[PDB]
Design a protein around this ligand. Structure first.
Ligand SMILES: [Mg+2]
Ligand SMILES: [Mg+2]
Ligand SMILES: [Mg+2]
Ligand SMILES: [Mg+2]
Ligand SMILES: [Mg+2]
Ligand SMILES: [Mg+2]
Ligand SMILES: [Mg+2]
Ligand SMILES: [Mg+2]
Ligand SMILES: [Zn+2]
Lengths: 148, 102, 127, 113, 59, 79, 207
RNA sequence: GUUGGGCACUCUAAGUUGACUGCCGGUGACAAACCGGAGGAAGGUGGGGAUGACGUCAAAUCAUCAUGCCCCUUAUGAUUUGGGCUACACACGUGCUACAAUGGACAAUACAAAGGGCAGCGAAACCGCGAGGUCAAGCAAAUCCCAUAAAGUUGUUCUCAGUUCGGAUUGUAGUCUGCAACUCGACUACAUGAAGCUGGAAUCGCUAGUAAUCGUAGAUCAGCAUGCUACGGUGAAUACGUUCC
RNA sequence: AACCUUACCAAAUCUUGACAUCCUUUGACAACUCUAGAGAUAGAGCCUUCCGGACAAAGUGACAGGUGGUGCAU
């Protein structure tokens, strides 16, 4: 019943370092409109990942998403079959950040900033629960590649 | 600054009577005098009253009324017995009520 | 000299005038970075100058009121973008193309009866 | 120990004193004013003089005993008289005039049916 | 019973806090607005008649 | 009255107690005024409070003073 | 379901029936106005009045009535109105004095039509032909819309029906319209019937 | 902004302009319309509201009101005191507080709307740890008041524990109102410190200044609001598509 | 929804009545205070004192009155 695709939103990059992903991540982290608390913990995690892996936070963060940012995805159709499909390039980033923040909140260690830094770090090192999500996703995609 | 003044407050519920009284008294004051400070309107504070349309139940279906007391200020600077007389000798219409300050 | 221009955002009014300076914004006799918390808001606010490359040619003086900090910041970029028209109408194409001069039509909606907010409705249960 | 009862070592003073029956946050702050120590301190590091200042201040304040006695005896009193609140105490139901049609489970216990 | 209730409310009572408000053309005791001394349903009626000054629908 | 005004007691009840202040105390006093406060001048009396269908007996003691008569005439019979 | 068009149109293109401002003494003056609006029980069934506009200003009440029969309300020499004033000061206690203005095309008016046919139905005539002659005489007098509706225990029945007839255009959703509305009730021995009427006359904007 | 001075700017509210597929390009049966663009603050019913067709549910209401019939008229009527509608072995619905570190406590500091106010709002000062109290100014309003908005931002401290989370329950001393707070008011201070560590089957709201969150005002109201109606501050993600309910 | 609201219940009470219209007698009406009672109510001092026209009461029969039923009569 729905009409065509309605245009997506946009945002502006941060001036700390210029990249749309930071603002998108901020809006994903934000609970109840508390953009400030979001910005603070994200800045702190970029500082702490400059500490841990001594390289540019941009580089190691982009690397993290490029590890947890899939290329496939399943659906369901009709008995109901689950069907792989090319992921959209926007949805790649969307799902990568989504998995990132969810499992960062679920890492269950002390603090949010430390959680985030740990999870981007494990991503860059091709580990973590976000990478585990992507593992299981490509897993159940290739075990259903017969249904394209 | 400070000077003598004959100031007036006008209040009704719609604007078409307020304005067509105010322009009249403007004209009277600049007839018997001059130097009138033109009408200063005011924030027009309305009063919403909300009701349930029903009698017994069905509260979720309401109705909203409102009065809008449209308030209008004029200040007649030039003081003269002519203008006090002309301005007291017109206490019309019924829809609007005046208030002089002397 | 001066270049005046009004700005509005949600319930906000920022009357704004540009005088030639270096790029410092004072707000009700207050430095802008002290008035506003987050540098994202200063970036949003300097976005007009960012597009039209006039970043380092003006100082700023402001009387603002109404609304909160992000609202009045967006009001300030709007007033900037309307005053640089008096400065230089040649910038109009850049600003039009960029989306600076549009008063955002958005304003908070009205609570509707039966609903707990504009849109949100009570917890529905068939029982 | 202070008032015949232990208190935590690693909790600070203002907080540790609250683990007495009879002494809360306000009274703890006021006690520490009277026996002037700092609140930042921690009772693993406090000294004999500080601790004794505190004990001397605490002895004036009914706590860890007489307070249990006051409460119990007041309730038993209003039960021994056939009062409304004491009837409620004897039955295990709210006392301040709450509604027991629903949501009275602190005094009623869990759900029985 | 509404007429006896109206009698009681239209008399003064022993102590003032006992006093109260019910509408005048009706005698409905609930949901009476005292700038009008009219119940909500009678208010709606008279406003649709136009017999109340100033009032009209909103928005 | 839970307040600096001092307690509340109904005047008729006070008068009847002062009438019974001869301390012979042959009679139960009858009443409807549960609202009243109990004083130390009521000890050893026997009051007969109206619960809503009965003028029920209550014996007064010294543990019953900062209280009310109504605390001893339960209006709700529940078994 | 639907609502009173006069209530919808108040403030839009028709005035109130009550032009007076008050802030403190307001509701008292309102109940006074209501007593006046009630006191027409001395001439309602006879004089065939439409509506009453009460004005109040400077201790005075410039009331106005609208009727089809000014003679049955003035009397023989203008004495009946003064009789009314004197009956009415007794209940007002202010400088009361009445006005009276005609409405010609007596059959083109809403409440007049409705209470006319209610009087007829109480005189036991057929509701169907009643409505029908009403629509026909109004559309002949000149009316760019009529509607009529009667509901009750019709035909002395045990169950109830509503019917309604129309001709022309009576658009109730339009706000340029100036549709006049009215309602009446007939005390029939079977129960209570309720007429309605929605007459349209012709678009003129006052403002 | 207090006065002097001005009505520039803002704001207020009356009269007006403007959005009309009105102009251009393309598609199309030149039509109707559709896609895209310029202009413009906004563009395709700009956002929202009010407006609810003939009729269906013999829907609801005879306790707003009126009303046919029936029924009571020493009673199925009326006055008063007191009680009950606040009960409780349990089941369901709708909301509030929480389960904690995007957090608790504590000190400093900032940005609003909209509304109400006469025997009514009660400024300032003083007293009290606080709920408040004494005296008392202005105020029938863009003037005075409710009224310091909070979330925030910046600092200190807590260290993942039934805790400095939570704040029920209960006991004490109190305040305000009231003809009187046991039945059966709210608020405060002190002390105690319940289950609760993110919720089974199932299920709900929401497509943008929306959900989510933060406080604020009003109606009724002597007194009582976790509800109702209105208000603004911060402010998302997603909507490929109609395969399936 | 403390009372009133309030209809429900207990008790104490009233029967042209708590409310309206009419007739007769008169009358300017209250209020203030005291006693008994839970108070409504009765006993009192008590003036309430004529503004055809007014006020209230008192007697009386029509008459009232009902949040009682039927929303499947309207
Ligand atoms: Mg609801
Ligand atoms: Mg009340
Ligand atoms: Mg039915
Ligand atoms: Mg009946
Ligand atoms: Mg209830
Ligand atoms: Mg706490
Ligand atoms: Mg009651
Ligand atoms: Mg039914
Ligand atoms: Zn009413």
């Amino acid at each position: 019943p729905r009409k065509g695709s309605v245009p997506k939103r946009d945002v502006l990059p941060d001036p700390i370092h210029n990249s749309k992903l930071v603002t998108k991540l901020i809006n994903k982290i934000m609970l109840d409109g508390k953009r400030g608390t979001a910005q603070r913990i994200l800045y702190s995690a970029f500082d702490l990942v400059e500490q841990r892996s001594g390289r540019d936070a941009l580089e190691v963060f982009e690397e993290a998403i490029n590890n947890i940012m899939p290329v496939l995805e399943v659906k369901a159709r009709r008995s109901n079959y689950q069907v792989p499909v090319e992921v959209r390039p926007e949805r790649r980033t969307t799902l990568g950040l989504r998995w990132l923040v969810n499992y960062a909140r679920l890492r269950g260690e002390k603090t949010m900033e430390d959680r985030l830094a740990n999870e981007i770090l494990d991503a860059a090192n091709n580990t973590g629960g976000a990478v585990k999500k992507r593992e299981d996703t490509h897993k159940m995609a290739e075990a259903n590649k017969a249904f394209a | 600054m400070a000077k003598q003044k004959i100031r007036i407050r006008l209040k009704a519920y719609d604007h078409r009577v307020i304005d067509q009284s105010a322009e009249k008294i403007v004209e009277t004051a600049k007839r018997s005098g001059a130097d009138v400070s033109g009408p200063i309107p005011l924030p027009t504070e309305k009063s919403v009253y909300t009701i349930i349309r029903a009698v017994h139940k069905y509260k979720d279906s309401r109705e909203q009324f409102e009065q809008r007391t449209h308030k209008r200020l004029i200040d007649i600077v030039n003081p003269t017995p002519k203008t006090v007389d002309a301005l007291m000798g017109l206490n019309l219409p019924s829809g609007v009520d005046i208030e002089i300050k002397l | 000299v001066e270049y005046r221009g009004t700005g509005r955002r949600k319930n906000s009014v920022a009357r704004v005038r540009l005088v030639p300076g270096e790029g410092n914004i004072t707000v009700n006799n207050r430095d802008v970075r002290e008035y506003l918390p987050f540098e994202s808001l200063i970036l949003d606010l300097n976005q007009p100058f960012d597009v039209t490359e006039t970043k380092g040619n003006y100082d700023v003086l402001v009387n603002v009121h109404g609304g909160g900090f992000t609202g009045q910041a967006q009001a300030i970029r709007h007033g900037i973008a309307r005053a640089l028209l008096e400065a230089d109408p040649e910038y109009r194409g850049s600003l039009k193309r960029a989306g600076l001069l549009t008063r955002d039509p958005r304003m908070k909606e009205r609570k509707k009866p039966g609903l707990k907010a504009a849109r949100r409705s009570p917890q529905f249960s068939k029982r | 120990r202070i008032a015949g009862v232990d208190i935590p070592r690693e909790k600070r003073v203002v907080i540790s004193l609250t683990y007495i029956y009879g002494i809360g946050t306000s009274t703890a702050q006021k006690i520490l004013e009277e026996a002037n120590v700092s609140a930042d301190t921690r009772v693993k590091d406090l000294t004999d003089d500080e601790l004794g200042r505190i004990r001397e201040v605490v002895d004036g304040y009914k706590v860890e005993g007489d307070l249990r006695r006051e409460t119990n005896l007041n309730i038993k009193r209003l039960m021994e008289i056939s009062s409304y609140r004491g009837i409620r105490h004897r039955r295990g139901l709210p006392v301040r005039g709450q509604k027991t049609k629903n949501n009275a489970r602190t005094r009623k216990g869990p759900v029985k049916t | 019973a509404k007429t006896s209730m109206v009698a009681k409310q239209q008399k003064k009572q022993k102590y003032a806090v006992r006093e109260y408000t019910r509408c005048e053309r009706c005698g409905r005791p609930h949901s009476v607005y005292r700038k009008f001394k009219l119940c909500r349903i009678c208010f709606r009626e008279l406003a649709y008649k136009g017999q109340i000054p100033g009032v009209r629908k909103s928005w | 009255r839970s307040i600096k005004k001092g307690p509340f007691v109904d005047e008729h009840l006070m008068k009847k107690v002062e009438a019974q202040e001869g301390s012979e105390k042959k009679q139960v006093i009858k009443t409807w005024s549960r609202r009243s406060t109990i004083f130390p001048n009521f000890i050893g009396h026997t009051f007969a409070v109206y619960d809503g269908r009965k003028h029920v007996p209550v014996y007064v003691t010294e543990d019953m003073v900062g209280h009310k008569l109504g605390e001893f005439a339960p209006t709700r019979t529940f078994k | 379901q639907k609502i009173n068009p006069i209530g919808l149109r108040v403030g839009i293109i028709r005035d109130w029936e009550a032009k007076w401002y008050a802030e403190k003494d307001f509701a008292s003056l309102l109940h006074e106005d209501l007593k006046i609006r009630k006191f027409i029980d001395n001439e309602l069934k006879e004089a065939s009045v439409s509506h009453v506009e009460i004005e109040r200003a400077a201790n005075r009440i410039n009331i106005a009535i609208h009727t089809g029969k000014p003679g049955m309300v003035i009397g023989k020499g203008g004495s009946e109105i003064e009789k009314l004033r004197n009956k009415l000061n007794a209940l007002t206690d202010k400088k009361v004095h009445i006005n009276v203005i005609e409405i010609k095309k007596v059959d083109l008016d809403a409440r007049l039509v409705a209470e006319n046919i209610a009087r007829q139905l109480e005189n036991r005539a057929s509701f169907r032909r009643v409505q029908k002659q009403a629509i026909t005489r109004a559309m002949k007098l000149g009316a760019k819309g009529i509607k009529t509706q009667v509901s009750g225990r019709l035909g002395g029945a045990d169950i109830a029906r509503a019917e309604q007839y129309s001709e022309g255009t009576v658009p109730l959703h339009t706000l340029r319209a100036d549709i006049d509305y009215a309602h009446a009730e007939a005390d029939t021995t079977y129960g209570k019937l309720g007429v309605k009427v929605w007459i349209y006359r012709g678009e003129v904007l006052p403002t």
